[PDB]
Amino acid sequence: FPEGKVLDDMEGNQWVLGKKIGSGGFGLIYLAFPTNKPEKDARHVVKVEYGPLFSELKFYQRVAKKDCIKKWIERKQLDYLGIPLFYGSGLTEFKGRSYRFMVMERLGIDLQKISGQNGTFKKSTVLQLGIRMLDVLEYIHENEYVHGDIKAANLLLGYKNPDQVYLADYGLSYRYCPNGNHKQYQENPRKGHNGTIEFTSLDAHKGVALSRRSDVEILGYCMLRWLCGKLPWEQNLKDPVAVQTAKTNLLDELPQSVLKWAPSGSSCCEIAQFLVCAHSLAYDEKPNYQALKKILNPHGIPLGPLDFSTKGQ
Ligand SMILES: N#CCc1ccc(Nc2nccc(Nc3cc(C4CC4)[nH]n3)n2)cc1
């Protein structure tokens, strides 16, 4: 697609493209500017596909409303909420094929790229990331949505503020509570073992519709990975059933399963308690976000900027 190309979103706003700034599977990402405001400052990007983008579109149109997010932050006294802002979307012709685009908030580098020693960050960073995502999860959950794929590759540092962290890629996000109607529990083997096998919930392994607890479980597994440097099931990633039984054994054998895994110069008291609290949730139970943030921060410490320093690694 040529730089200079003017896109027209459903709202009738007009978006001039910049240089490709990467791509995933199903996604090309370009810089973008509105055609009316200045060009000193690329605040905006354009994601393009042509399935999973539509999931994001649904997520972002319903959940990522600026002022509503503004009302929320103010009440709960958060410095910020790790949700990318959404500006509009629409279609555009490239050959004779049509493509779907979404104009998103511009953001910095993803955490996996900037992992510390192996895939490891400093404990107090691991614990703040978990608290930050607890802020995000409360918000999306409250708005009928689960992420279903929390992991380092989908945690981005701010563009404006790098000490700010943001949860992205709502391509596996699921509306668990449409207008207050919680989904029923039904195991479906045919819908079994979607997600990132390393971090996906047991509900996900068993082909259950993702609910609030699955996100909490996922965050649990993630923290464990960012601290201890790997997971008991690092071996069995290609046998998802092996991964499921591993996860099952870890949760049925808490807290020790988790306390034992930590290297000596670090602790898993918080991560262990956190998973213990996550395991005691029924399929349709509201997580106690405030209590889990205490578990992650038992000394009621204030949150510094994120330390990713890799001095010595
Ligand atoms: N790093 C990296 C690759 C990467 C690609 C796509 C996504 N998904 C995504 N979802 C929602 C908003 C959003 N905004 C962006 C994207 C960028 C440029 C592309 C880096 N800044 N801000 N990006 C996230 C990371």
Q: Tell me which residues have their CB closer than 6 angstroms to ligand 1.
A: 21-22, 24, 27, 29, 45, 84, 104-107, 109-110, 156, 168-169
Q: Residue 34 forms beta bridges with which residues?
A: 15
Please name the amino acid found at residue 75: R
On whether both 122 and 271 belong to a single domain, the answer is yes
Task: With H, G, I as helix, E, B as strand and everything else as coil, classify residue 125.
Answer: helix
Distance CA 139, CA 137 (A): 5
Q: How far apart are the C-alpha atoms of 78 and 241, rounded to whole Å?
A: 39
The residue range of the domain holding 245 is 108-309
The answer to whether residues 160 and 277 belong to one domain is yes
Cα–Cα distance between 54 and 57 in angstroms, integer? 5
308 is in an annotated binding site: no
Q: How far is residue 165's CA from residue 106's CA, in Å, rounded to a whole number?
A: 12
Q: What is the atom index within ligand 1 of the atom nearest the CA of 84?
A: 12
26 is in an annotated binding site: yes
Residues 97, 167 within the same domain: no
Say what angle helices 123-142 and 289-296 make with each other, to 10 degrees. Answer: 180
Contacts of 100 (CB under 8 A, 6+ apart): 48, 49, 50, 53, 54, 57, 89, 90, 91
Breaks (C-N over 2.5 A) in the chain follow: 50
Å resolution of this model?
A: 2.4
- Is there a single domain that holds both residue 66 and residue 144? no
Kindly state whether residues 73 and 113 are assigned to the same domain. Answer: no
Catalytic residue chosen out of the listed positions 9, 110, 135, 149 = 149
Q: Which residues contact 86 (CB under 8 A, 6 or more apart)?
A: 60, 61, 64, 102, 103, 104, 105
Q: Is 73 annotated as a binding residue?
A: no
The last residue of one of the domains, among 107, 126, 161, is 107
Pick the last residue of a domain from 89, 107, 125: 107
Whether 149 is a known active-site residue: answer: yes
State yes or no: cis peptide before 2, omega within 30 of 0.
no
Which residues are CB-contacts of 81 (< 8 A; sequence separation ≥ 6)? 69, 72, 73, 135, 136, 139
Same domain, 201 and 242: yes
Q: Which two tokens stand for residue 10?
A: 């459903």
DSSP 45-100: EEEE---HHHHHHHHHHHH--HHHHHHHHHHHT-S------EEEEEEEESSSSEEE
Name residue, tokens 């596909």: 49
Instruction: Output the CA–CA distances (angstroms, integers) from residue 79 to 35, 132, 201, in the order listed.
Output: 31, 10, 30
Q: Which of 28, 44, 45 to mutate to test the pocket of ligand 1 (most atoms within 8 A of CB)?
A: 45
How crowded is the C-beta side of 130, counted as CA atoms within 13 Å? 33
> Measured at the alpha carbon of residue 64, what is the angle toward residues 58 and 66, in degrees to the nearest 5?
145
Which residue matches tokens 């001039």? 16
Pairing of strands 174-175, 165-167: unpaired
Question: Which token pair is 108?
Answer: 């910095």
DSSP string, 201-259: -HHHHTTPPP-HHHHHHHHHHHHHHHHHSS-TTSTTTT-HHHHHHHHHHHHHTTTHHHH
